[PDB]
Design a protein around this ligand. Structure first.
Ligand code: HEM
Ligand code: DEB
Length: 402
């Protein structure tokens, strides 16, 4: 019986489901969105897969008699897919190399650190607005607005252009065959929004990251083409805040349900950085990441046939007991080195410095401002986003004063 990634087994106590699969076959056939695929749940296997470049990240490449379909582009018209997939994460070397090197020249640690004061101020202002007591949805009031405001400032997106794309991005995070048309339509809205944003930045340059990317170049890697610039801007906008929203929300939930863990962090401030790493290891937002077998590729003693769609379960790998002992225990003091929540290999997250900064500042500020913060509902009643693309929490009631 081939597992169906659409079943509740993968959205209800799903890490137990992953453990059962890993135990039987760390690399096994599955069904998803009406197509055959291979799910990799073992840590060694997942790391090997992400390191094997025969497993391509480019959905635009064409192969004779093959119709390449990445689950994440469900409902996307071809031109829209291209707008979404002409960037680092959707490119293979040598294209990937050139794009990443050019973007790395401007998306630096220096630029990220320069934003630290802004992240702190935005965080402070959002917390100032929730009051001192009562129940509030910490996602709508904090976890979601902080990252979205930060990415907008990083990319030169004016205030008048912010309270809208969040809704489209949300529809895109879920992959429901029933809403394939609406998903494709939300995608087109994001494209149109980015096209107007780039147009505005080209005519009115600033000191933001997008303005800089419009000018970036180098003798060897040349520069970003119009299509590359637009697509990179699009992914930087979406990935630039959604993963962070998931981190802050999941992090808040985990600390609220692990009193011992929270106490330790509050006790020793130097322990916060690793707490964020453990939060990402425990429940990775990018639960699975997709690859396409350009050639036959053997992983874990299993021959993945050419043209196969491979779903590397980053999250499942993080709970492989062979790599992370007592994997189901959330321990902010554990050695988290090696987790795959930021990827592995040439596509390793470019936003890691900003993600860690946002998580550290956000959680430190939230739990520091509200010492009696408690969950507004039973832990078992929290609703987890039904998505293998980006796991997270969209609504989380909390009691500001316990
Ligand atoms: C907690 C938050 C974050 C997590 C968990 C995360 C996770 C990841 C993962 C798993 C990958 C590799 C994907 C693959 O192998 O196909 C990745 C790639 C990347 N991330 Fe993040 N990310 C986060 C935040 C950010 C932020 C804030 C930005 C931008 C502002 C960002 C920009 C990117 C880019 C551009 C890549 C593509 C790199 C490449 O393909 O060479 N990430 N991220
Ligand atoms: C709809 C499909 C796309 O998803 C998204 O952009 C999601 C909103 C983001 O949260 C994803 C999950 C990121 O966080 C990173 C893991 C990967 C990202 C940087 C890529 O480059 C990747 C090609 C990506 O754009 C697509 C999978």
């Amino acid at each position: 019986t081939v597992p169906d990634l659409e079943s509740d087994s993968f959205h209800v106590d799903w890490y137990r489901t992953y453990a059962e699969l890993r135990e039987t076959a760390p690399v096994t056939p599955v069904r998803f969105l009406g197509q055959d695929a291979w799910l990799v749940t073992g840590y060694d296997e997942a790391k090997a897969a992400l390191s094997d470049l025969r497993l391509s990240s480019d959905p635009k490449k064409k192969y004779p008699g093959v119709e390449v379909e990445f689950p994440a582009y469900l409902g996307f018209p071809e031109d829209v897919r291209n707008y979404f997939a002409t960037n680092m994460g959707t490119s293979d070397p040598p294209t990937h190399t050139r794009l990443r090197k050019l973007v790395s020249q401007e998306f630096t640690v220096r630029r990220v650190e320069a934003m630290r004061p802004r992240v702190e101020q935005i965080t402070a202002e959002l917390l100032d607005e929730v009051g001192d007591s009562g129940v509030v949805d910490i996602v709508d009031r904090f976890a979601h607005p902080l990252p979205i405001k930060v990415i907008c400032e990083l990319l030169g997106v004016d205030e008048k252009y912010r309270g809208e794309f969040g809704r489209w991005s949300s529809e895109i995070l879920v992959m429901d065959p029933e809403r394939a048309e609406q998903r494709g339509q939300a995608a087109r809205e994001v494209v149109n929004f980015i096209l107007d944003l780039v147009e505005r930045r080209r005519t009115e340059p600033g000191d933001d990251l997008l303005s800089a990317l419009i000018r970036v170049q180098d003798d060897d890697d040349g520069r970003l083409s119009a299509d590359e610039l637009t697509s990179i801007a699009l992914v930087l906008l979406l990935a630039g805040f959604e993963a962070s929203v998931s981190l802050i929300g999941i992090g808040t939930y985990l600390l609220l349900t692990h009193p011992d863990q929270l106490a330790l962090v509050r006790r020793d401030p130097s322990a916060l950085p690793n707490a964020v790493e453990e939060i990402l290891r425990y429940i990775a937002p990018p639960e699975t990441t997709t690859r396409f077998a350009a050639e036959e590729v053997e992983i874990g003693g299993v021959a993945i046939p050419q043209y196969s769609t491979v779903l590397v379960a980053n999250g499942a790998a993080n709970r492989d007991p062979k790599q992370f002992p007592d994997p189901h225990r959330f321990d902010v003091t554990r050695d988290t080195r090696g987790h795959l929540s930021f990827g592995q290999g040439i596509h390793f997250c470019m936003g890691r410095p900003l993600a860690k900064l946002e998580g550290e500042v956000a959680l430190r500020a939230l739990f520091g401002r509200f010492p009696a913060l408690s969950l507004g509902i039973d832990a078992d009643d929290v609703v987890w986003r039904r998505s293998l693309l980006l796991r997270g929490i969209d609504h989380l009631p909390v009691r500001l004063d316990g």
